[PDB]
Ligand binder design. Structure first.
Ligand SMILES: Cc1cc2nc3c(=O)[nH]c(=O)nc-3n(C[C@H](O)[C@H](O)[C@H](O)COP(=O)(O)OP(=O)(O)OC[C@H]3O[C@@H](n4cnc5c(N)ncnc54)[C@H](O)[C@@H]3O)c2cc1C
Length: 307
């Protein structure tokens, strides 16, 4: 009776390459919604929902990939054509939230349109797929394609590697799946003993996603996990993720020089600030960020999936 949760079926560890494009837009797999829950409190700027989908084992994936969802309806401008696919990073491990290899989960922020001037909402301008997803109920069907993506696959060749994960908002999704695989699940062939460090930037406390889960790893694996948060409307210029990275810049640089992998996922808007900060930090140390970056890319330590 140990701390790691048993997962099945272990034959999901036997594949040598990740599944890709198993289902395509012309003939999607019809999955079923198991549950939908809001992840945020009243003060969040908008709703972010957690959706568990039963694919019954027919649409397996690896951590870090995405599922494509085709919302119902006709393409707003392709008469007789189906809506385009929207991609969502999978937020669960390959065994899924019920530890049985039958489900996958998505972390979806509702894209709501407000008139800038009148602040008035106009539902005809809301994002179609995200609202359809957070409006779903148990038993509803969803058309899935994929899985897709290789950029965010977790490098497992060294089980003692260092992984520094920087997310904003729904960009936390792939990291929830990495971390359950590193810490929560009993996966015999992947026993993590390195350092995983998660930085998460959100608007405020009520907008934190999966905080209870991440906080718990702090108490169980104090030597292998670090977690820092930045609340842009409730912290110590206000607080963005780049500021936290600045705070720990020496450690981070030291880790990157030692071979650490670094990942960024979430809204593309997060990137410019981060890159400014890293250049300024490098400069203070007397290093060229440009040269450092070229080296991290060459060594395959730099992983970005922003949208
Ligand atoms: C690799 C990848 C991973 C992703 N992972 C995630 C994830 O984990 N979670 C997540 O929440 N998203 C994720 N996304 C984004 C996701 O794919 C969708 O882009 C997002 O959910 C919005 O799609 P939608 O169909 O709701 O909006 P769409 O209907 O495509 O609308 C796009 C935007 O246009 C605004 N808009 C629409 N019509 C008008 C109009 N007439 N005038 C003015 N504005 C208008 C809408 O309000 C919306 O903001 C990811 C994207 C990629 C590429």
């Amino acid at each position: 009776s140990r701390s790691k949760v048993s997962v099945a079926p272990l034959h999901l560890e036997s594949a040598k390459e990740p599944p890709l494009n198993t289902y395509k837009p012309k003939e999607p797999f019809t999955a079923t919604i198991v549950s939908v829950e809001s992840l945020v409190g009243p003060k969040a700027p908008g709703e972010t929902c957690h959706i568990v989908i039963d694919h019954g084992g027919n649409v397996p994936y690896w951590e870090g990939q995405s599922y494509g969802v085709i919302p119902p309806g006709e393409n707003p401008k392709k008469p007789g054509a189906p809506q385009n696919v929207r991609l969502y990073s999978i937020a669960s491990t390959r065994y899924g939230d019920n530890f049985d290899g039958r489900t996958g989960s998505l972390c979806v922020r509702r894209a709501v349109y407000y008139d800038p001037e009148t602040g008035k909402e106009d539902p005809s301008k809301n994002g179609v797929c995200s609202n359809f997803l957070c409006n779903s109920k148990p038993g509803d069907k969803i058309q899935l394609t994929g899985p897709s993506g290789k950029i965010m696959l977790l490098p497992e060749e060294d089980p003692n590697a260092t992984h520094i994960m920087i997310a904003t908002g729904t960009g936390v999704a792939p990291f929830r799946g990495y971390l359950r695989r590193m810490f929560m699940e009993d996966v015999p062939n992947y026993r993590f003993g390195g350092l995983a460090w998660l930085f998460l930037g959100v608007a405020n406390s009520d907008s934190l996603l999966y905080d209870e889960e991440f906080t718990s790893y702090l108490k169980q694996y104090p030597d292998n996990f670090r977690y820092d948060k930045a609340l842009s409307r409730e912290q110590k210029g206000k607080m963005y993720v780049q500021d936290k990275i600045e705070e720990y810049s020496d450690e981070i640089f030291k880790l990157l020089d030692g071979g650490a992998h670094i990942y960024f996922c979430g809204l593309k808007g997060m990137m410019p600030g981060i890159q400014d900060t890293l250049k300024k930090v490098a400069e203070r140390r007397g290093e060229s960020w440009d040269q450092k970056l070229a080296q991290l890319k060459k060594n395959k330590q730099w992983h970005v999936e922003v949208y």
